[PDB]
Amino acid sequence: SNSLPSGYRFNEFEIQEAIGEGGFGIVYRAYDHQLERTIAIKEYMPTSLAKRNDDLSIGLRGERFGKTFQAGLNSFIQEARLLARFSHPGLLHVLRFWEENGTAYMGTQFYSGTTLKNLQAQQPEKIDEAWIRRLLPPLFSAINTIHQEGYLHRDISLDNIQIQESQLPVLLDFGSARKEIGNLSDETEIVLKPGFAPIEQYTEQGPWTDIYALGAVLHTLIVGSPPPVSVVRSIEDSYQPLTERRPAGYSPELLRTVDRALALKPEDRPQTIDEMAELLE
């Protein structure tokens, strides 16, 4: 681990535990001693570009990485600014942003629970049609709120949806820094998510682009894995409609909603979140 220790201080903030560590940032449970509340702190930390110094600042692993490190940092800032436009229970709420230690930090609301990816791995028996139909109204609402302000998510999968202990979902992260680093570094594998990204993201984007990825999430919850990579589908589509598979315990109505969201071409999909929600009725 490259993470700050429990007890580390940012003035009034105190690090309590590193709770998420990926290749591009670390997430901490932390505590605000001024307001006496638990928060999360997200630290930009691209491990392929940077390492932890003795004084716990961040430094480049090689001088050739400086331009790409800075571009990822700028994208991290821009994502914080985007999230700061919203005050919605299903979107990660940003409290503070600051630069320190040669990197940048986002203070955010702290959310209970775990990611949808982990819930699906650990408690797949909890995921059934009734649970999915309770998940969708607040998840729809969060995604639609992004769309109504003129933005798109473009990085939806199970990995960045939080399921709180209340079961309500939160969108945590748009992958902006990761995707910018991957584009600049020709590390194409960290830009789009195979099976979740629709054909138009591979090089015409709009709400239907997020709707496809949401379909892919739902497909994963229902049968355990995402649909085939969309570029492969665009050559020879091996997608088997869920209405024909008929997984046990699932209504044709929910299955056909997923199939429609997964239509190969943008114009054949529901065009707005509201259109997709109507299919369930």
Distance CA 117, CA 132 (A): 14
What number of CA atoms fall less than 13 Å from residue 77's CA on the CB side?
10
Residue 232, CB-side half-sphere exposure with 13 Å CA sphere:
8
Residues 54 and 40: their CA atoms lie apart, in Å, by 24
- Alpha-carbon distance of 103 to 88, in angstroms, equals 27
Q: What is 52-69 written as a DSSP string?
A: E-TTS-EEESSGGGHHHH
Helices and strands, number each (H, E), in the chain:
9, 11
CB 144 within 8 A of CB 46: no
Q: Is 25 helix (H, G, I), strand (E, B) or coil?
A: strand
Nearest CA-CA partner of 98 in 33, 10, 24, 171: 10
Specify the DSSP element, H or E, that contains 41: strand 37-44
d(CA 177, CA 59): 17
CA 234/CA 180 separation, integer angstroms: 26
- Residue 47 CA, distance from chain mean position: 19
DSSP 5: P
Distance, in Å, from the CA atom of 256 to the CA atom of 34, rounded to the nearest integer, reads 51
Counting every residue written for the chain, the total comes to 281
What span, in angstroms and rounded, lies between the C-alpha atoms of 193 and 212? Answer: 12
Please give the backbone phi and psi of residue 84, each rounded to the nearest 5 degrees, phi first. -70, -10
CA 114 to chain centre: 13
Contact 201, 154 (CB under 8 A): yes
φ/ψ of 124, rounded to 5, equals -60, -20
- 13: helix, coil or strand? strand
- Report the distance separating Cα 64 and Cα 47, nearest Å: 14
Taking the C-alpha atoms of residue 190 and residue 14, their distance in angstroms, rounded to an integer, is 31
Range of the structural domain that residue 101 is part of: 1-281
Instruction: Collapse the DSSP code of 99 into the 3-class scheme (helix H, G, I; strand E, B; otherwise coil) and give the result.
Output: strand
Locate breaks in the chain with C to N over 2.5 A; list the residue preceding each: 203
| Residue 33, CB-side half-sphere exposure with 13 Å CA sphere | 10
Tell me the HSE value of 81 on the side-chain side, using a 13 A CA sphere.
7
Q: Dihedral sign, CA of 193, 194, 200, 203?
A: positive
Resolution, angstroms, 1 dp: 1.6
Contacts of 7 (CB under 8 A, 6+ apart): 14, 15
CA 35/CA 19 separation, integer angstroms: 22
Beta bridge pairs of residue 13: 10, 32
| Domain count along the chain | 1
Q: Where are the alpha helices (DSSP H) in 54-153?
A: 66-83, 116-122, 129-148
Give the DSSP H/E element, type plus range, for residue 94.
strand 94-100
Q: Which amino acid is at 150?
A: G
Experiment type:
X-ray
Per-residue tokens: 13 = 């903030």
Task: For residue 275, give the 3-state DSSP assignment.
Answer: helix
Nearest to 246 by CA among 230, 258, 232: 258
